[PDB]
Amino acid sequence: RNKPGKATGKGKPVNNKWLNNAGKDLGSPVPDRIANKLRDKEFKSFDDFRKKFWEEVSKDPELSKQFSRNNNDRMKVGKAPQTRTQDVSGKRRSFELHHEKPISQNGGVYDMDNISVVTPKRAIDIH
């Protein structure tokens, strides 16, 4: 979809309720332990990045424990976890990765500091 590139950024430390703020404000940030696993690595596109992102989440003991078994299975194959029913919006019922500063202006495609996790509902709201 997009163009190849390498991941950069540091992200932020998170508690045991990582996505509790998903959507609200700018959503949840990229965990620092996850950034350390993706940093400097190259990707064919943002979609390939997204798949690698969720896979790393499934391998991080302190993060996967925050998800149900069915959601961990989704992340293990590169898919985003399903959100609670109340946070769904049409065909979009899983967490989405949002760019703070849109690719349009400036950019920041693989910059994990310009990437966050938000719910479908707020993903639309913010826009």
């Binding site: 149900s68 069915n70 194959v77 898919k79 976890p81 399903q82 609670r84 029913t85 019922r93 899983s94």
Partner: protein
């Protein structure tokens, strides 16, 4: 598989087979088929929290097919709704 129209058409064992079918599509490349199965799960269980029973189970119960079936049984019974097929 065969998707029945009502929960009353499903034995408990049969409902578990639907859950594993959903678990299979959960790991599929796309969600196209999964969403169709999830819609059916929501329609027949009639539970207000819908897919949350699958992806956001309560801590007071096991996060497993058996735990799902158990919660559904208790909710429907408490609300006077018809339960799983005794067959």
């Amino acid at each position: 598989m065969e998707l029945k129209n009502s929960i009353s058409d499903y034995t408990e064992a049969e409902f578990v087979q639907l859950l594993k079918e959903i678990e299979k599509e959960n790991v599929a490349a796309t969600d196209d088929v999964l969403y169709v199965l999830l819609e059916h799960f929501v329609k027949i269980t009639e539970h207000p929290d819908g897919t949350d029973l699958i992806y956001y189970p309560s801590d007071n119960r096991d996060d497993s097919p058996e735990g799902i079936v158990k919660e559904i049984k208790e909710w429907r019974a408490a609300n006077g709704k018809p339960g799983f097929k005794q067959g």
